[PDB]
Design an enzyme around this catalytic site. Structure first.
Site, PDB file in Angstrom:
ATOM      1  N   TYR A 510       0.894  -1.186   0.000  1.00 33.85           N
ATOM      2  CA  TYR A 510       0.000   0.000   0.000  1.00 33.85           C
ATOM      3  C   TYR A 510       0.921   1.221   0.000  1.00 33.85           C
ATOM      4  CZ  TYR A 510      -3.695   3.315   1.136  1.00 33.85           C
ATOM      5  OH  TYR A 510      -4.570   4.374   1.118  1.00 33.85           O
ATOM      6  N   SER A 593      -5.762   0.829  -4.643  1.00 33.54           N
ATOM      7  CA  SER A 593      -5.645   2.306  -4.508  1.00 33.54           C
ATOM      8  C   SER A 593      -4.173   2.721  -4.595  1.00 33.54           C
ATOM      9  CB  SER A 593      -6.279   2.791  -3.232  1.00 33.54           C
ATOM     10  OG  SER A 593      -6.242   4.209  -3.159  1.00 33.54           O
ATOM     11  N   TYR A 594      -3.669   3.417  -3.573  1.00 35.96           N
ATOM     12  CA  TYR A 594      -2.249   3.848  -3.562  1.00 35.96           C
ATOM     13  C   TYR A 594      -1.382   2.606  -3.766  1.00 35.96           C
ATOM     14  CZ  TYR A 594       1.599   7.053  -2.347  1.00 35.96           C
ATOM     15  OH  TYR A 594       2.721   7.843  -2.377  1.00 35.96           O
ATOM     16  N   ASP A 671     -16.499   3.861  -9.845  1.00 35.54           N
ATOM     17  CA  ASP A 671     -15.635   4.217  -8.688  1.00 35.54           C
ATOM     18  C   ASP A 671     -15.701   5.732  -8.482  1.00 35.54           C
ATOM     19  OD1 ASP A 671     -13.811   4.472  -6.662  1.00 35.54           O
ATOM     20  OD2 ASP A 671     -12.245   3.256  -7.615  1.00 35.54           O
ATOM     21  N   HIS A 703     -15.115   1.678  -5.370  1.00 35.95           N
ATOM     22  CA  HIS A 703     -13.677   1.443  -5.073  1.00 35.95           C
ATOM     23  C   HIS A 703     -13.529   0.108  -4.341  1.00 35.95           C
ATOM     24  CE1 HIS A 703      -9.508   2.532  -4.637  1.00 35.95           C
ATOM     25  NE2 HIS A 703      -9.569   2.403  -3.331  1.00 35.95           N
TER      26      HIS A 703
END
Ligand SMILES: *[C@@H]1O[C@H](CO)[C@@H](O[C@@H]2O[C@H](CO)[C@@H](O[C@@H]3O[C@H](CO)[C@@H](O)[C@H](O)[C@@H]3O)[C@H](O)[C@H]2NC(C)=O)[C@H](O)[C@H]1NC(C)=O
Ligand SMILES: *[C@@H]1O[C@H](CO)[C@@H](O[C@@H]2O[C@H](CO)[C@@H](O[C@@H]3O[C@H](CO)[C@@H](O)[C@H](O)[C@@H]3O)[C@H](O)[C@H]2NC(C)=O)[C@H](O)[C@H]1NC(C)=O
Ligand SMILES: *[C@@H]1O[C@H](CO)[C@@H](O[C@@H]2O[C@H](CO)[C@@H](O)[C@H](O)[C@H]2NC(C)=O)[C@H](O)[C@H]1NC(C)=O
Ligand SMILES: *[C@@H]1O[C@H](CO)[C@@H](O[C@@H]2O[C@H](CO)[C@@H](O)[C@H](O)[C@H]2NC(C)=O)[C@H](O)[C@H]1NC(C)=O
Ligand SMILES: *[C@@H]1O[C@H](CO)[C@@H](O[C@@H]2O[C@H](CO)[C@@H](O)[C@H](O)[C@H]2NC(C)=O)[C@H](O)[C@H]1NC(C)=O
Ligand SMILES: *[C@@H]1O[C@H](CO)[C@@H](O[C@@H]2O[C@H](CO)[C@@H](O)[C@H](O)[C@H]2NC(C)=O)[C@H](O)[C@H]1NC(C)=O
Ligand SMILES: *[C@@H]1O[C@H](CO)[C@@H](O[C@@H]2O[C@H](CO)[C@@H](O)[C@H](O)[C@H]2NC(C)=O)[C@H](O)[C@H]1NC(C)=O
Ligand SMILES: *[C@@H]1O[C@H](CO)[C@@H](O[C@@H]2O[C@H](CO)[C@@H](O)[C@H](O)[C@H]2NC(C)=O)[C@H](O)[C@H]1NC(C)=O
Ligand SMILES: *[C@@H]1O[C@H](CO)[C@@H](O[C@@H]2O[C@H](CO)[C@@H](O)[C@H](O)[C@H]2NC(C)=O)[C@H](O)[C@H]1NC(C)=O
Ligand SMILES: *[C@@H]1O[C@H](CO)[C@@H](O[C@@H]2O[C@H](CO)[C@@H](O)[C@H](O)[C@H]2NC(C)=O)[C@H](O)[C@H]1NC(C)=O
Ligand code: NAG
Ligand code: NAG
Ligand code: NAG
Ligand code: NAG
Lengths: 729, 729
Positions: A510, A593-594, A671, A703
């Site tokens: 992450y 995500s990240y 999303d 998401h």
């Protein structure tokens, strides 16, 4: 060895469930625990129980009651039905007030359908609710509602509710209503999104829908106009039907007014004192205004002397946002978590009349949060025990003698519980210590009077017995010294682990700013299946940018996202590979995500350490993400401010190097956080250069992609890719 | 052998190019062929050439001239630059008129930028162009323009240009301007899309674009309000700058006015006679109105007696739309292709004063089209030769003695050319016969005076020599008798084909109504690579619903799409498998558009004949496709009319059976014809049932997905899937 392994079926069908004991402290001695659809009142000291509401009570309701809310008085209860979710926290539902004395449903002046938010007064049975972006207050549950605001509009003026940006970043909630400690005043925030640009994505709904619906959400991308926040306070005690109520506005400090500002947090101190935390668009300067009510002018005033300014030149102010102050009963003194000169966050005693701050705690650890401030002791969770950044333990500090600090959970069950959490009672007489690992979750109730453990509420004994039959994988948390600094990592080692044998390695990643991926929590996730059945070591590393380790490590990637954290993950894999049990030819990486941004960056790094990768809902260019998050760590996307890094930190740029790795790009069409645009641009870049890659779009999925069907499909597809890439059976 | 094989690289990089000779007949004896960027005039009889325009002429233009248009007079030329494509035919471009006598570029009153359509008068140098949905006429290229319409609007009132539906279905073009034979009148159509619902899809433009653009196209899905068409005619000879021009409207026949109607085609007959073909929304009743200009009232009048009504109870009227009439010089008699009582389309002599029609041709074949109507002979292409539905040959019929019909191309080069096409001169003095197969494309110029072949323009000799080195696959076209009816099929057999050996089989499928997949055309496509290198037999079958075989076979799937054609393709695979050279364990199917609908249907049929399939831009539910196409074959989506079949012909319904086959769903995010919605719904259905499948979205790609990069990537990804499924190296 003849035992079952944790299969993906067990994970997807939740065969092994972790029992939890969630209670609601309605008093300093009693809590409400729902059992067999029956709300029960439990005396904490005695341990006995009584039926608050029998399931039959609402069996004839005719609707499925999603949730309940007991009035502080306990003479009324709210019933949530017709629950419709919007974003992470935002939702709309119908509410029916039920009398707990007359045992009758209130039928007159009922809360309207599609109520966005509803809240009881801190003391009493007052009800404040936001309907159609508008705030109404019902002084009595059986009396007509009093409308406070009249400027509410959809996707324009949000009164009492938070817009997408604030809901997902600033307040992390959908409520902008703050009741005064005795419910005399109601503090509310009006967000204006008239200028904030709209993100437009298509929704395909069901097969019946012929023409797709376009969904437009006010979303401020990096640099785009941010929403305007205006704070207000209204005297609910003076509410009248004859005339409209009057709302006094507390203006931001001049320093914040010079440019774009944000209302980070609102905390009531006394019945007449409120503390507002403002932060400028450039998130490196924040001022807290302790405003008090002036009876003569009937207007709240903010003394410039009482203001507290916290600036950070090293990086952003706050872990994610300015922390919350814990005022004393008098309300003329408060305790807050501020970073020390060394760069480690610690509790700091504060007086409203002295700008100087006195730190009451110090060390190379970090106060994770303040739990309760009793007149004699302050309780806080910290990672000090065994210098482990991924551990959480309850500590109490004598306010009169700060030197007297006592751990309350460190030496309870050291082998099974190292990550502890706590929920105190109304007067902190009793507290429930809940441990999430490293062993099975254990829930216990204790008494603050003598710090004595009254009893064990939940021990997850049944799950433990069932998990004995399955070959559950083991978890190893250690640290690798990089540049003379300890960087911790966790490794879900497969069952019957042999250091001599070489196993494939998947690096779950992450690497978000101020994030922890190596902790001490017991989790039954996809990695459990991968390690138990596919025998894949699943590892996670916390490098530069990780939190709970100090400002130095957290602020290292300041104004340079997609740089140090990406390099650290690649270096981690190299260290993991030379450990001796990792197949250098079979190392993979996956992230959400990240994590997807880092996964894409490391795959396009051209390092040659990783073979394949799965990026789910990945961020491609930081100019496509929301302003609050991006501007905090990357600055403004302007030619005079980090515009270069904004363009140098794009996944699309490294497309040519993706030709050496296997890539799976999964993203949900609907999303709202990481828009499909980011995944779409990555695909276009790879198609243009000619990179061969696999992709999977999930229609009408957010998401989370947590719809039962999609959740099962996404992990099934990901399982196939990982096994295929690792040449596994 | 050591000969190389046709690789995907050869196909993607167009290594082997089929030379073509495309000329423009500017006169009955001269044509314009562009060579080395030089427009050249070639005398047809002599064969000599002269430079019309040297490349240097427009080397100093400063812009890339996309295309040119020579005035009929030859004293002026149009230069198209700044070409911007919209849909299949629609486009916008800037135009510069060039004097071919003064050798100077017209600089005054230049055609405006972003001109949607520009056309020269049939005779003379008049210019009519549509700018901003508005029609302007320039009587002289160097004189100010005269604006005709003033009601033009974007996505509302289209004047002189066709809306999406008409452009892609009714007119198959972006031009609604029809000049009178001597250019006295200009006939135009005004389409109104005020009610037609808009399809909204997202466009991600480039990496610079921060917020995606939502593209809204007036698109009438099955049952949705269709556009309103109004025909008009204006006397260009009376155009004045002092006053606006007056447009006379020719109303539709009363039969068409009762409900929704369409203007299928507009054909000028004389300088004062025009023929309008109208068709009701229910495409089974069409009326042609031969309207003439009344000098006294200065208004066009349609005689009800002259009207010709063609109704079809078996199925839809016309192959795709009513055919075009070919009037005689007198204009009081015309020849049109009408279906005979037996059900085979044939030429039918018609008189404006006799409703009775006399068929001049008859048989079990079909007149593909009328090419030229000379005072003594009528030339038409047909599939009569060797009773082959996939063959095209030129024939001429003496008008005075219809019994005297002479083939003109059947016995030219029978082995190399069986699919012929023709382009006659202004007075049909000379004609260019172009054969597309079964051998290399051959282009030859002939003289109608004595039906003598003057010379050969292009013989693709160089390509032939190069193709000798490569191991090119062979093509086999035969027929399988099903239910005592001949159904033809083509098979691209791999090189060194051995009937004993069993080869994998990929069934390229389209199965569209009135479509032919088994023809005699030489094509260098992806199948060539698959058969030459991967050694996969690529086969195509024309079953019920195929055209050029009679109304019985074409109208068989009437009001029942996704039924007979899907079953026929599965039955074809069974027949192909029992032939003896097909691996029953490795049979696949792939298709685009309707082919994708059939590909999905056959995969979800549950037959078990196919192993894997690739559906590109597939139609899922017929209630998502445009009205003109769907309503023509499936009727209206109304509870009283075929609403059941509309809901019983959805790919999503067969999702559970997709669990037995490998499925690849490829679709372009920016598709205007088959909206991504259709692919999105298929994916959601498979995700819900749990069917594991691969997918690939191409961002900012249309139905063609023909962008060089995407075209290469789509076939590369498809090649990998086919090889993986067929367990090929
Ligand atoms: C939310 O933000 C918008 C944008 O700032 C606010 O709209 C603005 O409202 C003011 C009201 O005075 C407008 O000022 C006036 O505009 C008119 C012309 O529209 C002009 O004739 C007056 O002299 C005066 O300048 C301002 O133009 C307008 N801005 C816009 C429309 O972009 C809106 O009021 C805010 N809402 C709340 C409840 O705060
Ligand atoms: C294209 O189609 C639209 C829809 O039919 C046409 O709009 C229509 O225009 C007529 C003009 O007379 C409108 O009738 C009038 O409407 C007003 C109210 O808007 C009413 O007060 C009058 O008594 C009269 O009924 C009609 O309502 C309107 N329909 C709409 C807006 O849906 C449009 O004119 C067409 N364009 C062309 C150039 O043909
Ligand atoms: C648990 O038991 C105690 C007694 O041991 C309860 O306390 C009393 O409950 C009675 C119930 O009628 C009250 O009348 C008394 O006033 C209570 N005494 C005190 C000191 O509170 C207690 O209520 C029980 N708890 C539950 C949840 O049943
Ligand atoms: C309380 O405020 C509302 C909103 O301004 C008032 O309702 C409006 O009154 C005006 C009077 O001219 C009307 O034009 C509006 O249409 C009303 N509604 C809205 C939504 O604006 C209401 O009258 C006020 N009540 C009192 C007693 O002042
Ligand atoms: C709740 O708190 C408010 C604020 O302290 C109280 O309001 C004040 O009460 C005192 C004592 O009665 C008065 O002298 C002040 O004039 C009040 N201020 C205002 C703004 O009215 C309120 O009484 C409290 N309510 C209860 C039930 O204790
Ligand atoms: C908050 O951040 C901004 C942006 O980095 C800082 O503004 C810069 O300040 C430095 C000096 O410290 C100048 O050299 C830069 O030119 C300024 N602008 C930019 C675009 O970097 C600002 O000083 C910071 N504030 C605090 C309190 O640290
Ligand atoms: C091909 O050659 C013929 C002559 O054999 C050309 O015909 C003549 O061309 C001259 C050119 O100056 C004209 O003056 C004559 O009037 C033409 N005679 C006829 C009967 O047309 C012909 O133009 C040549 N074609 C090309 C394209 O150069
Ligand atoms: C030709 O028609 C156009 C369009 O009606 C006329 O231009 C309009 O004239 C009116 C006169 O009141 C104006 O209000 C409009 O703004 C004009 N433009 C448009 C686009 O409507 C033009 O005047 C006519 N010419 C003659 C000579 O009649
Ligand atoms: C083009 O065709 C039109 C239509 O036939 C001709 O217009 C007519 O011409 C005749 C002969 O001059 C007149 O008697 C009619 O009155 C004309 N009709 C109209 C509507 O004006 C036109 O003259 C032809 N143009 C040329 C150059 O031959
Ligand atoms: C054109 O098609 C429509 C729709 O199929 C036909 O209308 C039907 O006609 C049959 C008799 O032929 C009736 O039994 C149906 O009830 C009618 N309506 C429907 C909803 O099917 C119409 O007759 C056809 N016209 C021609 C000329 O064939
Ligand atoms: C309702 O509560 C009673 C309490 O004894 C319990 O026995 C019963 O199973 C409950 N029913 C449901 C559906 O939870
Ligand atoms: C909510 O909607 C239901 C269904 O229309 C209706 O019966 C009920 O009275 C509504 N409640 C309110 C408070 O409007
Ligand atoms: C331009 O035309 C001349 C004609 O002789 C030819 O030689 C030359 O190659 C042409 N140039 C281009 C770029 O086509
Ligand atoms: C088209 O645009 C170009 C660039 O602005 C300009 O030079 C040219 O004159 C324009 N043409 C017309 C006819 O408006």
């Amino acid at each position: 060895d003849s035992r079952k392994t944790y299969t993906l079926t067990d994970y997807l069908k939740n065969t092994y469930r972790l029992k939890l004991y969630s209670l609601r402290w309605i008093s300093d001695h009693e809590y409400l625990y729902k059992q067999e659809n029956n709300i029960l009142v439990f005396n904490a000291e005695y341990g006995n129980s009584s039926v608050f509401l029998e399931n039959s009570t609402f069996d004839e309701f005719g609707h499925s009651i999603n949730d309940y809310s007991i009035s502080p008085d306990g003479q009324f209860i709210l019933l949530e039905y017709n629950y419709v979710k919007q974003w992470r926290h935002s939702y709309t539902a119908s509410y029916d007030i039920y009398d707990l004395n007359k045992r009758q449903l209130i039928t007159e002046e009922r809360i309207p359908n599609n109520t966005q938010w509803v809240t009881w007064s801190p003391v009493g049975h007052k009800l404040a609710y936001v309907w159609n972006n508008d705030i109404y207050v019902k002084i009595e549950p059986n009396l007509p509602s009093y409308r406070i605001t009249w400027t509410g509009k959809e996707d324009i003026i949000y009164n009492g509710i938070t817009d997408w940006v604030y809901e997902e970043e600033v307040f992390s909630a959908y409520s902008a209503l703050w009741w005064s400690p005795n419910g005399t005043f109601l503090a509310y925030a009006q967000f204006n999104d008239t200028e904030v640009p709209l993100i437009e994505y298509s929704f395909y709904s069901d097969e019946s829908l012929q023409y797709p619906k376009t969904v437009r959400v006010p979303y401020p991308k990096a640099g785009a106009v941010n929403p305007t926040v205006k704070f207000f306070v209204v005297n609910t005690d003076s509410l009248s039907s004859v005339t409209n109520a009057t709302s006094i506005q507390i203006t931001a400090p001049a320093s914040m007014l010079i440019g774009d500002h944000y209302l980070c947090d609102v905390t009531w101190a006394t019945q007449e004192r409120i503390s507002l935390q403002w932060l400028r668009r450039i998130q490196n300067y924040s001022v807290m205004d302790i405003c008090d009510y002036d009876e003569s002018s009937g207007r709240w005033n903010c003394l410039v002397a009482r203001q507290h300014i916290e600036m950070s030149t090293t990086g952003w102010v706050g872990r994610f946002r300015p922390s919350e102050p814990h005022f004393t009963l008098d309300g003329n003194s408060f305790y807050k978590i501020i970073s020390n000169e060394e760069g480690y966050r610690h509790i700091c005693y504060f007086q409203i009349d002295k700008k100087d701050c006195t730190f009451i705690t110090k060390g190379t650890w970090e106060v994770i949060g303040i739990e309760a401030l009793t007149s004699d002791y302050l309780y806080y969770i910290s990672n000090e025990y065994k210098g482990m950044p991924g551990g959480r333990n309850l500590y109490k500090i004598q306010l009169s003698d700060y030197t007297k600090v006592t751990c309350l959970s460190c030496e309870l069950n050291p082998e099974r519980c190292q990550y502890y959490s706590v929920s105190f009672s109304k007067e902190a007489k009793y507290y429930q210590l809940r441990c999430s690992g490293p062993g099975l979750p254990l829930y216990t109730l204790h008494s603050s009077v003598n710090d004595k453990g009254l009893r064990v509420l939940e021990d997850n004994s049944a799950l433990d017995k069932m998990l004995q039959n399955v070959q559950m994988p083991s978890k190893k948390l250690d640290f690798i010294i990089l540049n003379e600094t300890k960087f911790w990592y966790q490794m879900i080692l497969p069952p019957h682990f042999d250091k001599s044998k070489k196993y494939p390695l998947l690096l779950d990643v992450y690497a978000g700013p101020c994030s922890q991926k190596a902790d001490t929590v017991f989790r039954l996730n996809w990695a459990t299946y991968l390690a138990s059945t596919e025998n894949i070591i699943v590892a996670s590393f916390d490098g530069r940018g990780s939190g709970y380790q100090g400002d130095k490590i957290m602020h290292a990637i300041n104004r340079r996202l997609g740089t140090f954290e990406v390099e650290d993950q690649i270096e981690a894999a190299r260290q993991f590979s030379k450990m001796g049990f990792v197949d250098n030819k079979r190392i993979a990486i996956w992230g959400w995500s990240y994590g997807g941004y880092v996964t894409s960056m490391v795959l396009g790094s051209g390092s040659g350490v990783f073979k394949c990768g799965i990026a789910v809902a990945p961020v491609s260019r930081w100019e496509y993400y929301d302003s609050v998050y991006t501007e905090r760590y990357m600055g403004l996307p302007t030619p005079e401010d980090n515009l270069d890094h904004y363009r140098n930190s794009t996944v699309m740029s490294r497309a040519e190097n993706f030709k050496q790795v296997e890539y799976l790009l999964i993203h949900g069409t609907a999303d709202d956080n990481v828009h499909f645009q980011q995944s779409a641009q990555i695909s276009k870049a790879l198609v243009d250069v000619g990179v061969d890659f696999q992709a999977m779009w999930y229609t009408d999925e957010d998401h989370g992609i947590a719809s039962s069907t999609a959740h099962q499909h996404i992990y099934t597809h990901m399982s196939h890719f990982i096994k295929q890439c690792f040449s596994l059976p």
